[PDB]
C-alpha cells in the first residue's frame, strides 16, 4: 500500500510547515529593533542572525528533497506537489523577512555610527586639531565618509528610514566636511 507513504509525506510536510512558522516568531522576537538599540547590540544581533540564515539555507535543500518525494508518491501526487509549492512560498516569505530585519538592523547600525562620526568632528577645536596626526585626522574622516555611504545604502530597503532621513544625513555630513575644511585652512 502506497497510502501510508503518502500520508507520511504529509506528516513530514505539516512538520516542516510548523517549524517555519516557529522560526518566523523567533526572528521577529529577537531581531525587532528600534532607534534605541545600542551599537554593540546591533553588531551582535547581526552576527546572531547569521545562525538563523544558516537554518533558512538548510530548508532549501530539504524542500528539494520533498519535491523529489512529492512526485514519487504516485496516487495523489498532484495535490502533493501543491503542498511542496505552498512550502517553498512559505520559505521564500521567511527569507524575505530575514533580509528585511537584517537590513533594518544594518541601517540602524549605520545610522547610530553616522551620529558618532558627526559628534567627533563637530566637537573638534582648532586647538584640538593641531594635536592629531594626519593619519588620525584622515581616518576620523574615513569613518564619516564610510558610514554616511553605508546609511545611504542600507536605508533604501529598510523600514523607518525614507528619503527625508537621508537628506538630514547629507546635511550632517556636509556640516562636518565643512567644519573639517575650516580647520585645515586654519592650520595654514
For residue 159, the domain's CATH number is: 1.20.58.1060
The residues, any chain, with a CB within 8 Å of residue 107's CB and separated by 6 or more, are 151, 154, 155, 158, 160, 161
- Looking at the chain, the residues that come just before a C–N gap of over 2.5 A are none
Do 40 and 65 form a contact (C-beta atoms < 8 A)?
A: no
Rounded to whole angstroms, the Cα distance separating 18 from 163 reads: 38
Rounded to whole angstroms, the Cα distance separating 63 from 86 reads: 11
DSSP 103: H
Helix (H, G, I), strand (E, B) or coil at 180: helix
Percentages (nearest 5) of helix, strand, coil residues in the chain? 85, 0, 15
Rounded to whole angstroms, the Cα distance separating 114 from 117 reads: 5
DSSP 159: S
Rounded to whole angstroms, the Cα distance separating 55 from 163 reads: 34
Q: What's the burial of 97, exposed, middle or buried (CB within 10 Å: 0-12/13-18/19+)?
A: middle
Give the Cα-Cα-Cα angle 178, 184, 188 (nearest 5 degrees).
140
Resolution (angstroms) equals: 3.0
Experimental method, per PDB record: X-ray
The residues, any chain, with a CB within 8 Å of residue 39's CB and separated by 6 or more, are 109, 112, 113, 116
Distances (CA, A) of 39 to 1, 43, 108, 164: 59, 6, 8, 23
Rounded to whole angstroms, the Cα distance separating 8 from 165 reads: 52
Q: Report which of 142, 149, 152 is spatially closest to residue 117, judged by C-alpha positions.
A: 142
Rounded to whole angstroms, the Cα distance separating 37 from 107 reads: 11
Tell me how many domains the chain contains. Answer: 1
Domain that holds residue 140: 3-187
Rounded to whole angstroms, the Cα distance separating 182 from 176 reads: 10
Give helix 39-48 / helix 50-72 axis angle, nearest 10°. 20
Amino acid at each position: 500500500g502506497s497510502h501510508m507513504a503518502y500520508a507520511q509525506f504529509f506528516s513530514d510536510v505539516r512538520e516542516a510547515e510548523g517549524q517555519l512558522q516557529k522560526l518566523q516568531e523567533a526572528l521577529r522576537r529577537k531581531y525587532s529593533c528600534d532607534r534605541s538599540a545600542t551599537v554593540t547590540r546591533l553588531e551582535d544581533l547581526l552576527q546572531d542572525a547569521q545562525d538563523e540564515k544558516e537554518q533558512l539555507n538548510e530548508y532549501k535543500g530539504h524542500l528539494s528533497g520533498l519535491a523529489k518525494r512529492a512526485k514519487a508518491v504516485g496516487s495523489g501526487n498532484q495535490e502533493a506537489q501543491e503542498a511542496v509549492t505552498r512550502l517553498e512560498a512559505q520559505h521564500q516569505a521567511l527569507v524575505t523577512l530575514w533580509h528585511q530585519l537584517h537590513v533594518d538592523m544594518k541601517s540602524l547600525l549605520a545610522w547610530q555610527s553616522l551620529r558618532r562620526d558627526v559628534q567627533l568632528i563637530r566637537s573638534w577645536s582648532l586647538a584640538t586639531f593641531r594635536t592629531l596626526k594626519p593619519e588620525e585626522q584622515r581616518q576620523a574622516l574615513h569613518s564619516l565618509e564610510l558610514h554616511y555611504q553605508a546609511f545611504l545604502r542600507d536605508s533604501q530597503d529598510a523600514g523607518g528610514f525614507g528619503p527625508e532621513d537621508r537628506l538630514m544625513a547629507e546635511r550632517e555630513y556636509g556640516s562636518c566636511s565643512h567644519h573639517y575644511q575650516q580647520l585645515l585652512q586654519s592650520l595654514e
